[PDB]
Symmetry: D2
Subunit: 223 residues, 4 copies
């Protein structure tokens, strides 16, 4: 389920790169998603070949990324047994953001729940709370594993990524500053291995890349 994210000097989307969310001219991200693979979609291939962005998310409706207002979001993993409690997960979304609920995935819930929990002014705390809530519903109505999560998300100025699991397995996250691109890449699995090592983001951690550089912070579902 490879994903990749970028924050730095603008590059062509392809130079990292189904679904892409990118920032360019607007505070809202452009969003492109279809059920065709990077290779079967000449439109996606043309966009990725022609559009440049200094902040974007890409990920191999129920396709990521998701976007609402200034924010976009993508997630690798699962909430265990989700289909057995989808209704209650849906019911937990605030009215304000419910209009953005367009498909039936757990990923989309996690995003809208994080918005409902204050993602706009408190991304760490809000994601932390949304995860606690969904993990609790999984423990109540679902199955193992209750929460497996690697996610990337942005407000169009800062790029975030978090990795967490209710057990010992967590979808992987790596990041590295590219001197050749002059910006940061964050990925589910390391690609370019000629230009320096990738730094693993450990489970239970949140990465923030913004005006100060890249910094990590402890991350666990809210008390």
């Amino acid at each position: 389920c490879r994903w990749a994210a970028y924050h730095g000097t603008p590059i062509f989307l392809e130079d990292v790169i189904f679904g892409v969310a990118w920032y360019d001219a607007r505070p809202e991200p452009g969003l492109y998603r279809d059920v065709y693979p990077a290779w079967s979609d000449p439109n996606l291939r043309a966009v990725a070949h022609h559009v440049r962005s200094g902040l974007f998310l890409s990920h191999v409706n129920n396709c990521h990324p998701f976007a609402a207002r200034r924010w976009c979001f993508m997630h690798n993993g699962q909430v265990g047994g989700f289909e057995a409690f989808r209704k209650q997960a849906d019911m937990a979304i605030a009215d304000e953001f419910y209009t953005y609920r367009k498909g039936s995935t757990d990923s989309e819930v996690l995003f809208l729940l994080a918005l409902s929990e204050g993602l706009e002014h408190d991304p760490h705390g809000a994601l932390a709370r949304a995860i606690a809530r969904l993990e609790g519903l999984s423990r109540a109505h679902g199955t193992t594993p209750h929460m497996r999560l690697s996610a990337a998300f942005s407000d169009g100025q800062t790029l975030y990524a978090a990795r967490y699991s209710s057990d010992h397995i967590a979808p992987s996250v790596y990041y590295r500053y590219s001197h050749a691109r002059q910006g940061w890449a964050v990925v589910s699995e390391p690609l370019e291995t000629d230009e320096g090592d990738w730094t693993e983001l450990r489970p239970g951690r949140m990465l923030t890349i913004g005006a100060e550089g890249a910094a990590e912070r402890d991350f666990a579902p809210a008390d």
Copy 2:
């Protein structure tokens, strides 16, 4: 937003035929084909409609929706739906929530009807489903609160209904075709003979003992 439904001796789907088609053939469930490409310009749909034969099918210019043995398509609207969509979704019984895959009012109607016992009481269950959505639109929506023409089936019987909270109701017509040897029900008249208009506040039932109309009100 034209639709067409058929019940009688099997014909190729095209002999009647956003887009979709639900048809019964060899299984108690309907096959369901739907896509966002124009019917005119999707060659796969063309091949399906040119090659598949069926004695009970529904097609609609996404509808139809299908769950278990039932399928359902709907033309019209619930006024101001978007402003109370959460409340409508929360009214769906736990048992049918798994089938709610998009965000339309039409899909909620179908699943609310199933929740109200469509499987064993079609007339009553749709009546109750509509009164709930119209009620929610009165409270939280706008006018028109309910505009509805709908066709739906369990694979044995074809039903259609026409109802509206005001004076405009999306149209429904039906006709027995002697050349196909079956009934066609449509939203806009497709010669062989005239079409019969289903008036507002009526539900049509086509099964083993012909076609019959009866009063219908939420």
Copy 3:
């Protein structure tokens, strides 16, 4: 098959927009987006036109226009009468160099590639003229009436061209003007009229019209 083309200070594509768009931004070759899908409501198209900015693009409405090859793109409203009856002969006239670009089966794509075969890269006026005459003559011989109906917009990344010709009294319409608000030229299929039998040329020097007689 209505179209619009733009040349001037970069705007969002949506500000002058089956379906397609060819646009130049950062490469000598154009971007090409095209699908068989009500423009009105393709969400991906909606994103692209809402977010991509360009100072030279063509938009229409493998068989969708525009077409692109190397630095050139091309778009056509009209028809070559009875084309289907002689498509083989028409494909045969495309030079070996350009046949690789022949991806679908329309008359429009054949015109573009025949024009490239006739030297569009160096002599846009004469090559399109020669390509139209060849296809019109094939229609006369093997096709049906109208033998040639054309309004076309096409570009090399620097210059925008449009032409209007017909073998009969009906020619798809072409109009143009300078948009002071956008600070660029708009050329459309539907203002100054570009009369039939004329080619228009828009570049760093302005707009100019000239006679065009396949």
Copy 4:
């Protein structure tokens, strides 16, 4: 690059069934044709169709998607004509005027099919494919590269199922076939049992299965 063909008492297409397509016979002398450019069992429509349509003769392959169909015939091909894009024009021009109208894409496989039709597939399936293959292989020798011809093909007219396996070198896409008592019909597969050896053609009809040497 993977295909399956069936001939026998009708079954749901799924009881046999990136890029994808299926051609099936049911109620008409021409086949139905479904093909699309995304992964099978992702396309809910393909799912619906395979789960709901029954046929006693169909071809499925896992525009440029196979199968191809024209008149009563359908055809699919695993393999390649080496260097094809360098002489595509020359290949198209060898298609007879009568069949040119069916040339919709740019693949080598489509031209093989239409060249076989041009060479008399409707009356001589063995001879026509042999001649179509020799012409393309020689164009590859002349203008393309190696490998000049690799072919496993399945093709049908609605009544008979054919398969053929040939290569200009040591690698030929594989073909196996077997009678399935459960389904009561023949299954023929390429790159998933009796192996169809290279330089062989298989014919399955009302008389049974039979092989013959095939030497373009």
